[PDB]
Design a protein around this ligand. Structure first.
Ligand SMILES: [Cl-]
Lengths: 650, 5
């Protein structure tokens, strides 16, 4: 006899839900709730109320464009007293005259996103399915069973609910706290974040699978990361670092994420102008916090001291900056080995999805095979630099300084450097350097000898003594250097982007030093400083090698014409061979030496001397005494001055 | 600004 039920309306209970699910701000118009936790609907009925003996109620939920039960994006479940742990359930908690209070639970591993809720009221012989409305399901750091679980309320407040923090800029020794409006709970943001997901490459590739996988805070974090700065047009931000931001808004101008998200949407999801590391991280932080993943912005600082070849190498992507900001998020990592639950580093700055998430403990341990993108993060806080100048650690460049983040629930900076790096020179810091960078050595060489005037080769002689092939970058350059420390213009430069070093091998990499280059930029030193920088860019380890080079003057040949008796009868033969490729003008000798002459014989030359063309002169000597005697010569030219020489006699 | 060394 019993008639089917007619729903008057469905109360979403936005207040008590917003309160219990910590989504009070996101529940202005619409129900948003977190997973793994009961929420409340109240059915108002027109006429007869629910009677458990008569009516059988089923609910259906779908999320995304291709829901399926196997993928977790669809679920059907009854209304009944027995409530299973970790499943989609609905049960009654109150029943008055007209109303029926329901309590719904979602799995703690339920996919996040927008859901359509349907009800099927079957009364005896009949039934009628229809839509109730929509709830949005978020990540739940309060839920012990959730992967993003976080056991400290103060931390939950900080890394999820707090909508302002500090982003640290400046330098290692002058840190500045810049305040920031994350505004993850402002009008529109939640929807815009949801859009960001539904435009992501993996969603286009396979929308159904994508929505399924948004159960994983790893997956979402990875997706949240590479979408803030995409190489696509769909990405949120456009980077620019050349103080030329007149086209759009200046990276330094922004004080919040919110306005960037809106601009991006309101203009067909097109790159906002412009951003830099810390703007990307803030945007990622906002998006992540909004979706319920505990997140924070961090700043790592670097410092570089003395035109050291490193500074030169960079002065003219994966480079070394004054500082760099990325985000860390909080989740378990059952995709990895045990014990990597906790902070995971994510880098939304330039799978296209890079970088992360990767455990921060994996970086400190140097377990660089841990997914995702461990070497890239490791590179951001580790640079090994070594000199040779005949090993000798160089400190012209320090990376991994004062890694900083806002302290929990206070207007203060928290130094988190210890989480990334072991103490310098510790058993652990070395133990971990090993695990990372599983004999490599380089020097400068000349081979044949060097003459002022002549062109000649210098070699970066690199030796892979180990069993591992490396792919290195090589800068090999030469400048003139002064007796009193100054450095002159370039007189030889060879850059090599790709230099492979096959195991247990060597290379001698030539650079040509041309007269034409050095000749007019030289000083009386005759000093060329050759310098090789060898970059292994994966580990971010460097080998420096430098060597100074003296361009010797041409020898003066001296011969003893006559006989060596303790009497007289001697003559001098003194020759120089011009080593230049040019007319050597206004040539003269001087010769003298006590015991051989008492008349310094200056002889001038009217004939300019050519390249290779030598120049002999003569002088008559009247020796006097018996013992050892040394003749002494000087030579002068227009463009070649003060070349000496001597010769012993008896 | 974020500055390259
Ligand atoms: Cl199905």
């Amino acid at each position: 006899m019993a008639e089917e039920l007619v729903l008057e309306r469905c109360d979403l209970e936005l207040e008590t839900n917003g309160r219990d699910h910590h989504t009070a701000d996101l529940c202005r118009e619409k129900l948003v709730v977190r997973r793994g936790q009961p929420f409340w609907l109240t059915l108002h009925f027109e006429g007869r109320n629910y009677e458990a003996s008569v009516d059988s109620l089923t609910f259906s939920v779908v999320t995304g464009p291709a829901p399926s039960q196997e993928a977790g994006t669809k679920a059907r479940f009854p209304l009944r007293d027995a409530v299973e742990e970790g499943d989609w359930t609905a049960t009654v908690v109150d029943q008055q005259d007209c109303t029926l209070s329901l309590q719904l639970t979602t799995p703690a591993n339920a996919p996040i996103g927008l859901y359509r809720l349907s009800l099927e009221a079957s009364t005896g012989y009949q039934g009628s399915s229809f839509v109730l409305g929509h709830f949005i399901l978020l990540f739940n750091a309060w839920c012990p069973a959730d992967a993003v679980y976080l056991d400290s309320e103060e931390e939950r407040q900080e890394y999820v609910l707090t909508q302002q923090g500090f982003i640290y800029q400046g330098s290692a020794k002058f840190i500045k706290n810049i305040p920031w409006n994350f505004g993850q709970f402002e009008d529109g943001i939640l929807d815009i974040c949801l859009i960001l997901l539904d435009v992501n490459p993996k969603f286009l590739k396979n929308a159904g699978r994508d929505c399924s996988r948004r159960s994983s805070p790893v997956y979402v974090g990875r997706v949240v990361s590479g979408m803030v700065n995409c190489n696509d047009d769909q990405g949120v931000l456009l980077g620019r670092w050349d103080n030329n931001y007149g086209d759009g808004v200046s990276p330094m101008s922004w004080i919040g994420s919110v306005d960037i998200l809106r601009r991006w949407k309101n203009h067909g999801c097109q790159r906002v102008k412009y951003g830099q590391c810390w703007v990307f991280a803030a945007v990622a932080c906002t998006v992540l916090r909004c979706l319920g993943i505990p997140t924070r912005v961090v700043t790592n600082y670097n410092s570089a001291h003395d035109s050291n070849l490193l500074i030169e190498y960079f002065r003219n992507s994966e480079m070394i900056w004054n500082f760099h900001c990325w985000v860390e998020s909080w989740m378990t990592r059952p995709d990895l080995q045990p014990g990597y639950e906790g902070w995971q580093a994510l880098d939304p700055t330039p799978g296209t999805y890079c970088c992360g998430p990767v455990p921060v403990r994996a970086i400190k341990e140097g377990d660089l095979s841990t997914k995702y993108d461990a070497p890239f993060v490791f590179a951001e806080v580790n640079a090994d630099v070594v000199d040779w100048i005949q090993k000798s650690i160089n400190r012209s460049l320090i990376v991994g300084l004062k890694i900083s983040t806002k302290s929990v629930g206070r207007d203060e900076r928290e130094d988190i450097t210890h989480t990334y790096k072991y103490p310098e020179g510790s058993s652990e810091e070395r133990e971990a350097f090993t695990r990372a960078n599983h004999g490599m050595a380089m020097r400068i060489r000349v081979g044949q000898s060097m003459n002022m005037g002549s062109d000649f080769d210098v070699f970066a002689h690199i030796t892979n003594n180990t069993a591992e092939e490396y792919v290195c970058r090589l800068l090999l350059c030469a400048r003139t250097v002064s007796y009193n420390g100054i450095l002159g213009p370039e007189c030889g430069t060879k850059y090599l982007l790709n230099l492979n070093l096959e195991p247990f091998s060597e290379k001698s990499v030539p650079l040509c030093i041309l007269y034409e280059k050095y000749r007019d930029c030289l000083t009386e030193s005759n000093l060329i400083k050759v310098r090789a920088l060898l970059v292994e860019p994966v580990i971010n380890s460097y080998l420096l090698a430098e060597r100074d080079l003296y361009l010797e003057n041409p020898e003066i040949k001296i011969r003893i014409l006559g006989e060596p008796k303790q009497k007289r009868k001697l003559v001098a033969e003194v020759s120089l061979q011009n080593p230049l490729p040019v007319a050597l003008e206004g040539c003269t000798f001087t010769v003298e030496g006590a015991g051989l002459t008492e008349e310094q014989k200056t002889v001038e030359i009217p004939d300019p001397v050519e390249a290779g063309e030598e120049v002999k002169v003569r002088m008559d000597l009247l020796p006097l005494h018996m013992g050892l005697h040394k003749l002494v010569v000087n030579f002068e030219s227009d463009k070649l001055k003060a070349v000496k020489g001597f010769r012993n006699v008896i | 600004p974020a500055l390259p060394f």
